[PDB]
Amino acid sequence: QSALTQPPSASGSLGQSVTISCTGTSSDVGGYNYVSWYQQHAGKAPKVIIYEVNKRPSGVPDRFSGSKSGNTASLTVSGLQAEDEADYYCSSYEGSDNFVFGTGTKVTVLGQPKANPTVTLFPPSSEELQANKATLVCLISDFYPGAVTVAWKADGSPVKAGVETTKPSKQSNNKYAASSYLSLTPEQWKSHRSYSCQVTHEGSTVEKTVAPTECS
Amino acid sequence: QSALTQPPSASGSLGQSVTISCTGTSSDVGGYNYVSWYQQHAGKAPKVIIYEVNKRPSGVPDRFSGSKSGNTASLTVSGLQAEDEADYYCSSYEGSDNFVFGTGTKVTVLGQPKANPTVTLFPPSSEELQANKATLVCLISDFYPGAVTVAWKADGSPVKAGVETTKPSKQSNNKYAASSYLSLTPEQWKSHRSYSCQVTHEGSTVEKTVAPTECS
């Protein structure tokens, strides 16, 4: 219902400011002074970062900004944080206990430094065994470009079964995690000498080997 | 400034009626008599489905209904509709400078069987323990609507300082799984008595405990 209109993208680079518009109307946007800007870090709570026009709530930084001119409002983000990557929404009052919500934004700070994952393999759980199971997890974390890619290996040859592997996810910082998991029978654990969780990201390969050996 | 809580994932048959709750911290949370719900669709903008409590705003069909039995607000859907699939958010109202959005519910139309998680916790490997490293891993897998909540306790008290959870992914058999992780120092691991990974999902919540041990 004539959503307010927004820009489907808005790249910036650490320290650089940015500005997203939100085209409105004489009736939605230049009719009152009730434009809210919402965040949307992603797969989360919306979060309001500006209301009633140019009003920066309790605990947002000195750097978020809004100003409207005519039936157009806009959001400005000086010196780009690194977590400002999120989707951005405008919402305006439009008379009658009601509001309109012109779509997202999702900018991208760019020139984000790359990390390679901190692979961490994990042997099966005393408990798990005491249970007759055996899962091996391989946690991948603290990497940027969130296109990892992984393989298991049993004593130096592949294993193409019982291996679910999730998909990257942002993580409080601005690196992503992904766990790799492989399901085995206690017997199969003891049958082979080691298992390596082999992972390659942005060229780099990193392989961590775990052996049925310590306790558990 | 946070703290409005919602069931992770709520499921329905297609024709059935659902309910999503929203609770808080008292002398406002709900006491708050505002509380409006927002339906949010894949990559569409949150729209506003209910406001000021039980007040539908009118492009909106009448199955939507709202309420509060005190400290907790309720949104219920009647005659589940296919496009009723989505994420759903309760908004509460703060110091005029502070609109408060609760965690959002995922309504799914059950397209296969309901499956609660399988929670599996792994302590820190001796290796990691040697590298003056120390991480807990909480693997959560094989479950219906791909929504779950993750909480960690150190000796029974909540611990929220060093934790990352991976939104869930379809595995290769249509159920999902996610994992969370807590990174501490070995010291910090050797100090508590036990660590707990609690997972919540549709009527049930599993909690597992790991303890420290030399295993050597």
Short mmCIF file of C-alpha atoms in Angstrom, two decimals:
data_model
loop_
_atom_site.label_atom_id
_atom_site.label_comp_id
_atom_site.label_asym_id
_atom_site.label_seq_id
_atom_site.Cartn_x
_atom_site.Cartn_y
_atom_site.Cartn_z
CA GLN A 1 0.00 0.00 0.00
CA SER A 2 2.33 2.57 -1.51
CA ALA A 3 5.15 1.59 0.85
CA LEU A 4 7.49 4.60 1.22
CA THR A 5 10.37 4.09 -1.26
CA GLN A 6 13.95 3.21 -0.34
CA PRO A 7 17.35 2.47 -1.91
CA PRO A 8 18.15 -1.23 -2.21
CA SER A 9 21.83 -0.83 -1.30
CA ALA A 10 24.32 1.64 0.15
CA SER A 11 28.01 0.78 0.45
CA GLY A 12 30.38 2.90 2.52
CA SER A 13 33.88 2.06 3.85
CA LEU A 14 35.05 2.26 7.47
CA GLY A 15 34.94 6.00 8.28
CA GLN A 16 32.94 7.51 5.37
CA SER A 17 29.36 8.56 6.21
CA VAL A 18 26.40 7.48 4.11
CA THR A 19 22.89 8.47 3.18
CA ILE A 20 19.76 6.57 2.44
CA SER A 21 16.57 8.28 1.29
CA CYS A 22 12.97 7.31 2.04
CA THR A 23 10.61 8.84 -0.46
CA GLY A 24 7.25 9.62 1.06
CA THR A 25 4.20 11.83 0.53
CA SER A 26 2.37 15.03 1.30
CA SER A 27 0.27 12.52 3.20
CA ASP A 28 2.96 10.03 4.39
CA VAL A 29 6.17 11.96 5.27
CA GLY A 30 5.54 15.73 4.62
CA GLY A 31 2.26 15.57 6.53
CA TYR A 32 3.64 15.10 10.01
CA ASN A 33 7.11 14.68 11.49
CA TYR A 34 6.85 11.05 12.50
CA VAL A 35 9.48 9.22 10.51
CA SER A 36 11.25 6.45 12.40
CA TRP A 37 14.37 4.72 11.16
CA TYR A 38 14.80 1.09 12.10
CA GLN A 39 17.91 -1.01 12.05
CA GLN A 40 17.60 -4.78 11.49
CA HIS A 41 20.99 -6.24 12.22
CA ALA A 42 19.59 -9.34 10.55
CA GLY A 43 17.73 -12.42 11.67
CA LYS A 44 16.89 -10.24 14.69
CA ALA A 45 14.90 -7.51 16.41
CA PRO A 46 14.21 -4.42 14.32
CA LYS A 47 15.58 -1.84 16.77
CA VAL A 48 14.60 1.85 16.38
CA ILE A 49 17.54 4.24 15.90
CA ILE A 50 15.72 7.55 15.44
CA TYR A 51 12.15 8.64 15.93
CA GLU A 52 9.88 11.59 15.50
CA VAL A 53 12.38 12.95 13.00
CA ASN A 54 16.02 13.57 14.12
CA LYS A 55 15.86 12.06 17.58
CA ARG A 56 18.56 9.68 18.67
CA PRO A 57 17.23 7.50 21.45
CA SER A 58 18.91 6.41 24.66
CA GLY A 59 22.14 4.65 23.63
CA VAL A 60 22.69 5.01 19.88
CA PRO A 61 25.78 6.94 18.82
CA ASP A 62 26.31 10.56 18.18
CA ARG A 63 26.59 9.59 14.53
CA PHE A 64 23.18 8.33 13.37
CA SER A 65 21.24 11.14 11.66
CA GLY A 66 17.91 11.87 10.04
CA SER A 67 16.55 14.92 8.25
CA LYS A 68 13.67 15.18 5.78
CA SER A 69 13.21 17.89 3.19
CA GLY A 70 10.01 17.61 1.19
CA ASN A 71 8.06 14.37 1.16
CA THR A 72 11.46 12.71 1.33
CA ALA A 73 13.34 11.77 4.50
CA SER A 74 16.90 10.47 4.82
CA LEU A 75 19.33 8.58 7.04
CA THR A 76 22.98 9.54 7.48
CA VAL A 77 25.79 7.48 9.01
CA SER A 78 29.09 9.35 9.29
CA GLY A 79 32.33 7.44 9.68
CA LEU A 80 31.09 3.87 9.12
CA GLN A 81 31.14 1.58 12.13
CA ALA A 82 31.52 -1.99 10.71
CA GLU A 83 28.41 -3.37 12.29
CA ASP A 84 26.23 -0.74 10.52
CA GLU A 85 25.79 -3.52 7.96
CA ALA A 86 22.11 -4.23 8.71
CA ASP A 87 18.88 -3.48 6.80
CA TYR A 88 17.39 0.00 7.26
CA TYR A 89 13.70 0.85 7.28
CA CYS A 90 11.75 4.07 7.11
CA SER A 91 8.32 4.17 8.67
CA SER A 92 6.07 7.18 8.64
CA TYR A 93 2.85 8.14 10.33
CA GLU A 94 0.15 8.45 7.66
CA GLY A 95 -2.83 9.61 9.70
CA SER A 96 -5.24 7.55 11.72
CA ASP A 97 -3.44 5.51 14.40
CA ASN A 98 -1.30 4.33 11.48
CA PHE A 99 1.94 4.07 9.58
CA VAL A 100 3.46 2.97 6.33
CA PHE A 101 6.87 1.26 6.13
CA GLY A 102 8.94 1.91 3.01
CA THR A 103 11.31 -1.02 2.65
CA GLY A 104 14.81 -1.98 3.76
CA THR A 105 18.29 -0.67 3.11
CA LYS A 106 21.14 -3.04 3.98
CA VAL A 107 24.25 -1.00 3.26
CA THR A 108 27.65 -2.65 3.33
CA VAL A 109 30.69 -1.17 5.00
CA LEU A 110 33.49 -2.22 2.64
CA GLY A 111 37.22 -2.56 3.19
CA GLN A 112 36.51 -4.98 6.02
CA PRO A 113 39.74 -6.67 7.03
CA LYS A 114 39.87 -10.43 6.38
CA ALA A 115 40.57 -13.01 9.09
CA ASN A 116 40.81 -16.75 8.30
CA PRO A 117 38.82 -19.02 10.58
CA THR A 118 40.04 -20.36 13.89
CA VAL A 119 39.25 -24.04 13.26
CA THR A 120 38.55 -25.92 16.48
CA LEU A 121 37.81 -29.66 16.14
CA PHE A 122 36.09 -31.39 19.06
CA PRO A 123 36.14 -35.07 19.93
CA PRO A 124 33.06 -36.80 21.27
CA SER A 125 31.74 -36.29 24.70
CA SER A 126 32.43 -38.77 27.45
CA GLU A 127 28.70 -38.53 28.10
CA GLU A 128 27.81 -38.93 24.43
CA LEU A 129 29.80 -42.18 24.42
CA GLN A 130 28.45 -43.27 27.79
CA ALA A 131 25.34 -42.96 25.63
CA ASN A 132 26.51 -45.02 22.61
CA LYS A 133 26.70 -42.10 20.15
CA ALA A 134 29.76 -40.17 18.93
CA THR A 135 29.50 -36.78 17.15
CA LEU A 136 32.54 -34.81 16.06
CA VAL A 137 32.07 -31.07 15.70
CA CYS A 138 34.45 -28.69 13.95
CA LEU A 139 33.74 -25.06 14.86
CA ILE A 140 34.75 -22.46 12.29
CA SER A 141 34.79 -18.89 13.68
CA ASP A 142 36.14 -15.35 13.43
CA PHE A 143 36.41 -15.12 9.67
CA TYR A 144 35.24 -12.31 7.38
CA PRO A 145 34.30 -13.21 3.80
CA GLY A 146 31.74 -15.69 5.07
CA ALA A 147 32.28 -18.27 2.37
CA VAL A 148 34.18 -21.02 4.21
CA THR A 149 34.11 -24.58 2.77
CA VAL A 150 34.77 -27.85 4.56
CA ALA A 151 35.52 -31.56 4.38
CA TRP A 152 36.06 -34.35 6.92
CA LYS A 153 38.78 -36.95 6.45
CA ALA A 154 39.23 -40.28 8.20
CA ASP A 155 42.86 -41.37 8.42
CA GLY A 156 43.74 -39.44 5.23
CA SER A 157 40.90 -40.27 2.82
CA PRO A 158 37.48 -38.68 2.52
CA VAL A 159 34.30 -39.29 4.46
CA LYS A 160 31.18 -38.32 2.53
CA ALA A 161 28.59 -39.42 5.04
CA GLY A 162 26.93 -38.34 8.26
CA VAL A 163 28.28 -34.84 7.80
CA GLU A 164 25.87 -31.87 8.13
CA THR A 165 27.48 -28.41 7.75
CA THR A 166 25.67 -25.11 8.51
CA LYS A 167 26.09 -21.78 6.74
CA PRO A 168 28.05 -18.68 7.73
CA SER A 169 26.50 -16.25 10.20
CA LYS A 170 27.49 -12.79 11.45
CA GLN A 171 28.64 -12.90 15.07
CA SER A 172 28.55 -9.89 17.41
CA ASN A 173 31.92 -8.88 15.93
CA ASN A 174 31.87 -8.79 12.11
CA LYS A 175 33.17 -12.27 11.51
CA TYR A 176 30.99 -15.33 10.98
CA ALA A 177 30.84 -18.84 12.44
CA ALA A 178 29.70 -22.18 10.95
CA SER A 179 29.96 -25.56 12.70
CA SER A 180 30.76 -28.73 10.74
CA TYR A 181 29.40 -31.93 12.33
CA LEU A 182 30.06 -35.62 11.63
CA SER A 183 28.14 -38.51 13.22
CA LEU A 184 29.81 -41.75 14.21
CA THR A 185 29.40 -44.93 16.11
CA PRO A 186 31.85 -45.39 18.97
CA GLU A 187 33.11 -48.35 17.00
CA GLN A 188 33.85 -46.30 13.90
CA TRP A 189 35.57 -43.75 16.14
CA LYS A 190 37.92 -46.47 17.44
CA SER A 191 38.20 -48.18 14.06
CA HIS A 192 40.04 -45.27 12.41
CA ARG A 193 43.16 -43.60 13.81
CA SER A 194 42.28 -39.95 13.38
CA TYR A 195 39.65 -37.70 11.84
CA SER A 196 40.60 -34.34 10.28
CA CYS A 197 38.19 -31.48 9.80
CA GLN A 198 39.75 -29.94 6.68
CA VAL A 199 38.65 -26.37 5.88
CA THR A 200 39.56 -23.94 3.10
CA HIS A 201 38.66 -20.22 3.10
CA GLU A 202 39.83 -17.53 0.68
CA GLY A 203 42.59 -19.76 -0.63
CA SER A 204 43.90 -20.75 2.83
CA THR A 205 43.46 -24.35 3.94
CA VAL A 206 43.70 -25.33 7.61
CA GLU A 207 43.12 -28.88 8.80
CA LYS A 208 42.73 -30.00 12.36
CA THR A 209 43.05 -33.62 13.20
CA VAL A 210 41.44 -35.25 16.18
CA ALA A 211 42.34 -38.63 17.54
CA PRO A 212 40.38 -40.84 19.91
CA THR A 213 42.90 -40.04 22.64
CA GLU A 214 42.91 -38.34 26.03
CA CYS A 215 40.19 -39.57 28.37
CA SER A 216 36.51 -39.40 27.28
CA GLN B 1 15.80 -1.01 26.02
CA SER B 2 15.27 -4.71 25.36
CA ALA B 3 13.72 -7.38 27.58
CA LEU B 4 10.41 -8.35 25.93
CA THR B 5 10.49 -12.11 25.50
CA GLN B 6 8.84 -14.29 22.86
CA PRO B 7 8.59 -18.02 22.19
CA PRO B 8 11.06 -18.99 19.50
CA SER B 9 9.05 -20.55 16.62
CA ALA B 10 5.31 -21.29 17.00
CA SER B 11 3.80 -23.85 14.62
CA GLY B 12 0.40 -24.58 13.15
CA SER B 13 -1.31 -27.02 10.87
CA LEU B 14 -2.86 -24.81 8.19
CA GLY B 15 -6.39 -24.10 9.46
CA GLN B 16 -5.41 -24.17 13.13
CA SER B 17 -5.22 -21.25 15.52
CA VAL B 18 -1.91 -20.20 17.05
CA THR B 19 -0.86 -17.88 19.83
CA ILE B 20 2.46 -16.14 20.41
CA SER B 21 3.11 -14.54 23.81
CA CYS B 22 5.26 -11.54 24.77
CA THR B 23 6.32 -11.00 28.40
CA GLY B 24 8.59 -8.57 30.31
CA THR B 25 9.81 -6.65 33.38
CA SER B 26 6.82 -5.39 35.21
CA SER B 27 6.40 -1.77 36.18
CA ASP B 28 6.02 -1.20 32.44
CA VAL B 29 6.38 -4.51 30.63
CA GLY B 30 2.72 -4.85 29.85
CA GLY B 31 1.88 -2.60 32.80
CA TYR B 32 2.60 -0.75 29.63
CA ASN B 33 -0.76 -1.04 27.91
CA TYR B 34 0.87 -0.16 24.57
CA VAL B 35 2.32 -3.25 22.82
CA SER B 36 1.79 -3.55 19.07
CA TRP B 37 2.65 -6.56 16.86
CA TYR B 38 4.45 -6.41 13.52
CA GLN B 39 4.35 -9.27 11.05
CA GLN B 40 7.59 -9.54 9.06
CA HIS B 41 7.80 -11.51 5.82
CA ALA B 42 10.99 -12.86 4.24
CA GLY B 43 12.71 -9.70 2.97
CA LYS B 44 9.67 -7.44 3.22
CA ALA B 45 9.36 -4.65 5.79
CA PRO B 46 7.77 -5.28 9.17
CA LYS B 47 4.11 -4.18 8.70
CA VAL B 48 1.92 -3.31 11.76
CA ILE B 49 -0.68 -5.98 12.56
CA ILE B 50 -1.96 -4.82 15.96
CA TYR B 51 -1.57 -1.64 18.01
CA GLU B 52 -2.17 -0.18 21.48
CA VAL B 53 -3.16 -3.75 22.21
CA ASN B 54 -6.20 -5.22 20.45
CA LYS B 55 -6.62 -2.56 17.80
CA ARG B 56 -6.33 -3.80 14.25
CA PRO B 57 -5.35 -1.03 11.85
CA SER B 58 -7.40 -2.16 8.87
CA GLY B 59 -5.76 -3.38 5.65
CA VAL B 60 -5.59 -6.25 8.22
CA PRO B 61 -8.01 -9.23 8.15
CA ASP B 62 -9.78 -10.16 11.44
CA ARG B 63 -8.09 -13.43 12.52
CA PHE B 64 -5.31 -11.40 14.07
CA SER B 65 -6.25 -10.62 17.69
CA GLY B 66 -4.21 -9.16 20.59
CA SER B 67 -4.43 -9.11 24.43
CA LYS B 68 -2.49 -8.95 27.72
CA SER B 69 -3.22 -11.15 30.76
CA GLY B 70 -0.83 -8.90 32.65
CA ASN B 71 2.91 -8.84 32.25
CA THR B 72 2.32 -10.76 29.05
CA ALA B 73 0.71 -9.77 25.78
CA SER B 74 -0.82 -12.28 23.36
CA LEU B 75 -1.16 -12.37 19.60
CA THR B 76 -3.44 -15.06 18.15
CA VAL B 77 -4.07 -16.26 14.63
CA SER B 78 -7.29 -18.00 13.62
CA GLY B 79 -7.66 -20.14 10.51
CA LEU B 80 -3.96 -20.33 9.69
CA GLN B 81 -3.36 -18.99 6.22
CA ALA B 82 -0.43 -19.90 4.04
CA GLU B 83 0.81 -16.28 3.89
CA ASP B 84 0.54 -16.12 7.67
CA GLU B 85 3.99 -17.69 7.64
CA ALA B 86 6.49 -15.12 8.89
CA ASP B 87 8.37 -13.58 11.80
CA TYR B 88 6.32 -11.63 14.37
CA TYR B 89 7.41 -8.93 16.77
CA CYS B 90 5.96 -7.29 19.86
CA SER B 91 6.80 -3.63 20.43
CA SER B 92 6.53 -2.06 23.86
CA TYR B 93 7.11 1.60 24.72
CA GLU B 94 9.89 3.31 26.70
CA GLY B 95 11.03 6.62 28.11
CA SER B 96 9.53 8.24 25.02
CA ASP B 97 13.18 7.88 23.93
CA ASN B 98 13.19 4.08 23.55
CA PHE B 99 10.72 1.83 21.64
CA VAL B 100 11.15 -1.76 22.83
CA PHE B 101 10.99 -4.71 20.42
CA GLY B 102 10.63 -8.26 21.79
CA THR B 103 12.42 -11.24 20.19
CA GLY B 104 10.01 -12.18 17.39
CA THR B 105 8.29 -15.49 16.83
CA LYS B 106 8.60 -17.44 13.58
CA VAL B 107 5.21 -18.77 12.50
CA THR B 108 5.75 -21.71 10.20
CA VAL B 109 3.03 -23.70 8.41
CA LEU B 110 4.11 -27.25 9.25
CA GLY B 111 5.23 -28.78 5.96
CA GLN B 112 6.78 -31.83 7.59
CA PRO B 113 6.98 -33.28 11.06
CA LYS B 114 7.73 -31.45 14.26
CA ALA B 115 11.07 -32.40 15.80
CA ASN B 116 12.60 -30.91 18.96
CA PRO B 117 16.33 -30.36 18.96
CA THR B 118 19.06 -32.87 19.89
CA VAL B 119 21.40 -30.94 22.18
CA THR B 120 24.98 -32.09 22.45
CA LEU B 121 27.62 -30.32 24.51
CA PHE B 122 31.37 -30.63 24.14
CA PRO B 123 33.94 -29.24 26.56
CA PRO B 124 37.38 -28.01 25.56
CA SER B 125 39.68 -30.69 24.19
CA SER B 126 42.95 -31.25 26.09
CA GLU B 127 44.62 -29.80 23.00
CA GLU B 128 42.71 -26.58 23.24
CA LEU B 129 43.36 -26.76 26.97
CA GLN B 130 47.10 -26.91 26.21
CA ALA B 131 47.02 -23.99 23.77
CA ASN B 132 45.91 -21.92 26.78
CA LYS B 133 42.53 -22.03 24.98
CA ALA B 134 39.11 -23.08 26.20
CA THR B 135 35.74 -23.23 24.52
CA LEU B 136 32.39 -24.92 25.07
CA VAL B 137 30.36 -26.03 22.10
CA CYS B 138 26.61 -26.57 22.15
CA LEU B 139 25.43 -28.41 19.08
CA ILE B 140 21.72 -28.24 18.50
CA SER B 141 20.28 -30.42 15.71
CA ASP B 142 17.62 -32.35 13.83
CA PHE B 143 14.52 -30.26 14.41
CA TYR B 144 11.35 -28.89 12.99
CA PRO B 145 10.62 -25.23 12.42
CA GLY B 146 14.12 -23.84 12.27
CA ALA B 147 13.82 -21.59 15.33
CA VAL B 148 15.34 -22.20 18.82
CA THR B 149 16.51 -20.11 21.81
CA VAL B 150 19.98 -20.60 23.35
CA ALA B 151 20.98 -19.82 26.91
CA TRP B 152 24.17 -20.65 28.82
CA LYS B 153 24.55 -20.84 32.58
CA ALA B 154 27.79 -20.95 34.54
CA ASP B 155 26.92 -22.79 37.75
CA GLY B 156 23.23 -21.94 37.25
CA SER B 157 23.61 -18.20 36.72
CA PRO B 158 23.14 -16.85 33.19
CA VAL B 159 26.39 -16.02 31.39
CA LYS B 160 26.03 -13.73 28.40
CA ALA B 161 29.48 -12.30 28.11
CA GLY B 162 31.25 -14.74 25.76
CA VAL B 163 28.65 -16.50 23.62
CA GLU B 164 27.83 -16.86 19.92
CA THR B 165 24.89 -18.69 18.38
CA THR B 166 24.58 -19.53 14.70
CA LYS B 167 21.06 -19.12 13.29
CA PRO B 168 20.01 -22.51 11.99
CA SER B 169 20.35 -24.13 8.60
CA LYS B 170 18.43 -26.85 6.74
CA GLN B 171 20.58 -29.98 6.96
CA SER B 172 20.41 -32.50 4.10
CA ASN B 173 17.29 -34.19 5.49
CA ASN B 174 15.15 -31.07 5.90
CA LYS B 175 15.39 -30.60 9.66
CA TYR B 176 17.63 -27.76 10.84
CA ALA B 177 20.47 -27.28 13.28
CA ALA B 178 22.42 -24.51 14.86
CA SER B 179 25.23 -24.26 17.34
CA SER B 180 26.34 -21.88 20.00
CA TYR B 181 29.70 -21.49 21.59
CA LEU B 182 31.16 -19.95 24.70
CA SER B 183 34.84 -18.94 24.73
CA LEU B 184 36.53 -18.61 28.14
CA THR B 185 40.03 -18.91 29.53
CA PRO B 186 41.10 -22.29 30.95
CA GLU B 187 41.35 -20.52 34.30
CA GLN B 188 37.75 -19.36 33.80
CA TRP B 189 36.71 -22.91 32.87
CA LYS B 190 38.56 -24.43 35.83
CA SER B 191 36.76 -21.97 38.11
CA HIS B 192 33.01 -22.76 37.71
CA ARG B 193 31.50 -26.06 38.78
CA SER B 194 29.56 -26.69 35.56
CA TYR B 195 28.41 -25.11 32.31
CA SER B 196 24.98 -25.50 30.82
CA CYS B 197 23.57 -25.10 27.36
CA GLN B 198 19.77 -24.68 27.44
CA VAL B 199 17.80 -24.82 24.17
CA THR B 200 14.11 -23.84 23.76
CA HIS B 201 11.68 -24.96 21.11
CA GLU B 202 7.88 -25.25 20.83
CA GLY B 203 6.77 -26.81 24.15
CA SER B 204 10.16 -28.12 25.31
CA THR B 205 13.54 -27.04 26.69
CA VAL B 206 16.60 -29.32 27.07
CA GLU B 207 19.55 -28.36 29.29
CA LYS B 208 22.89 -30.18 29.42
CA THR B 209 25.80 -29.86 31.83
CA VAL B 210 29.56 -30.22 31.31
CA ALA B 211 32.00 -30.11 34.25
CA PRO B 212 35.75 -29.51 34.39
CA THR B 213 38.16 -32.43 34.62
CA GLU B 214 41.86 -33.18 33.92
CA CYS B 215 40.92 -36.31 32.02
CA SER B 216 44.51 -36.07 33.08
#
